[PDB]
Ligand binder design. Structure first.
Ligand code: HEM
Ligand SMILES: O=C(O)[C@H](Cc1ccccc1)NC(=O)[C@@H]1CCCN1C(=O)OCc1ccccc1
Ligand SMILES: N[C@H]1CCc2ccccc21
Length: 454
């Protein structure tokens, strides 16, 4: 039995002011580098423990011992994401119900159905870049966010956000981004009942209303038309849970669609942005990935089967997820009294945080070169130990979107590498912006067309 280290305290505020930063995950990573595989983190009326080693995380990922916790961030996002899949407890009836109904909608097999819609948005991205003038550059996270938001709108509910037709976001997106910023800003507030925050609260309720109003209208419009489009909204209006025999009600469907729109906007766009960053910083890797894209994507429109052959592009995406897992932390609670790692006794209900970027830098697993971008680490997936690599979380509460995100990201990165050469024309210095997710802020490149027709 060891005593856990704890970072610096602020009297009665304990560790809470360490999150008074726009980069809380990066702060926690630097604390992990100083303190090691486990540290205690305290706020008024809150204790959690941050885990960084595969040795401890492999136990935390034992579903017989630990279940998904809603962190303070997830409790605040639940105010507009409700009991959708991401912000539900495992024991809530609507978690297992929605999970059983939606799993077949998110399978590898289902990606054959979504492919044509993904190609539609991906071709819009390639056409935007083809149409740039010689003097112009690409705003990488901006364009990747235009893409991922449009892909989930179209595959989700046959709705065109038309992000490539706009400087300024759809009204839904303005409310969604402002609601997320408010949820994330609330974490570090030592005094949240302060009247300074009355404007925030009035605005928050207005953004929740806007989100509910468009999504409720889209569900109502689809029920009215009777149209049977092959999208997630159709699957949710028609689907029945084999266990309860019930369908999802319209309120839960609204929380699922809100959840899927946040995920598409926030997650896959980050992965693609980090992938392009690492490619332009590692020209040998860029060359190897571009040879594969040229050899495999022989048709003007990529096919589902062709995207599955992009093995090296998949390895690039996994190496980007290793260094900068886009959704970098998840929360667990002890189902019963238990001893973590033969050293740290926990009581039933005790919370753990998994610091995925730190897990991904465990030198006992990956070797001394952990900071280097080497997709070849992923050449043989069998060589990666259980629970060493967890960008999609864990067990039955793992990312339902994983096949969808990797299919979209592989298709789009394949087409980018086929159609363009890329220049890091500003020698961009990595600056990682944090919301729920990570993105490389201010990342810009120039693309030179290889002039291959669509
Ligand atoms: C690169 C992209 C993505 C990454 C890295 C990512 C990562 C994650 C992770 C780490 C979790 C677990 C959260 C936890 O334990 O608290 C999760 C859950 C989830 N993700 Fe993703 N995700 C991605 C894309 C998507 C997309 C595109 C969708 C949907 C369109 C999606 C939908 C979900 C849902 C619904 C959950 C909750 C699943 C459940 O608990 O039943 N994700 N994701
Ligand atoms: O929200 C939390 O409880 C903790 C931070 C915290 C706050 C108050 C006291 C003690 C700890 N959150 C986190 O450690 C991380 C970093 C910032 C947000 N966050 C988090 O888990 O966000 C939710 C999330 C994001 C992505 C995937 C799943 C869940
Ligand atoms: N994909 C998960 C991980 C990050 C995130 C944010 C919103 C909704 C779902 C999710």
């Amino acid at each position: 039995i060891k005593e856990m280290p704890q970072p610096k305290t602020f009297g009665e505020l304990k560790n809470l002011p360490l999150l008074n930063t726009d980069k809380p995950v990066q702060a926690l990573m630097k604390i992990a580098d100083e303190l090691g595989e486990i540290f205690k983190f305290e706020a008024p009326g809150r204790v959690t423990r941050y885990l960084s080693s595969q040795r401890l995380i492999k136990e935390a990922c034992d579903e017989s011992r630990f279940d998904k916790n809603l962190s303070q961030a997830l409790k605040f996002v639940r105010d507009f994401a409700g009991d959708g899949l991401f912000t539900s407890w495992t024991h809530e009836k609507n978690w297992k119900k929605a999970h059983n109904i939606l799993l077949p909608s998110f399978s590898q097999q289902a990606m054959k159905g979504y492919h044509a819609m993904m190609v539609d948005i991906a071709v819009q991205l390639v056409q935007k870049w083809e149409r740039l003038n010689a003097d112009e550059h690409i705003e990488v996270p901006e364009d990747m966010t235009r893409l991922t938001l449009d892909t989930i709108g179209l595959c989700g509910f046959n709705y065109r956000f038309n992000s490539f037709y706009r400087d300024q976001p759809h009204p839904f997106i303005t409310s969604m981004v402002r609601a997320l910023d408010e949820a994330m800003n609330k974490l570090q507030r030592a005094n949240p009942d302060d009247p300074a925050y009355d404007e925030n609260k009035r605005q928050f309720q207005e953004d929740i209303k806007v989100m509910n109003d468009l999504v409720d209208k889209i569900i109502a419009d689809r029920k009215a038309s009777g149209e049977q489009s092959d999208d997630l909204l159709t699957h949710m209006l028609n689907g029945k849970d084999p266990e309860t025999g019930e369908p999802l009600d319209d309120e839960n469907i609204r929380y699922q669609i809100i959840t899927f729109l946040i995920a598409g906007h926030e997650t896959t766009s980050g992965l693609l942005s980090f992938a392009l960053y690492f490619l332009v910083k590692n020209p040998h890797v860029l060359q190897k990935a571009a040879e594969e894209a040229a050899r495999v994507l022989v048709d003007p429109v990529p096919s589902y089967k062709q995207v599955k052959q992009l093995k090296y592009v998949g390895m690039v995406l996994n190496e980007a997820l290793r260094l900068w897992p886009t959704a970098p932390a998840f929360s667990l609670y002890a189902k019963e009294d238990t001893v973590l790692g033969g050293e740290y006794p926990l009581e039933k209900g005790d919370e753990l945080m998994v610091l995925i970027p730190q897990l991904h830098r465990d030198k006992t697993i990956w070797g001394d070169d952990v900071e280097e971008f080497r997709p070849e680490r992923f050449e043989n997936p069998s060589a990666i130990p259980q629970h060493a690599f967890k960008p999609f979380g864990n067990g039955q509460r793992a990312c339902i979107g994983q096949q969808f995100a990797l299919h979209e990201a592989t298709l789009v990165l394949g087409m980018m590498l086929k159609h363009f050469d890329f220049e890091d024309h500003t020698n961009y210095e990595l600056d990682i912006k944090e919301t729920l997710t990570l993105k490389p802020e201010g990342f810009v490149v120039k693309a030179k067309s290889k002039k291959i027709p669509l």
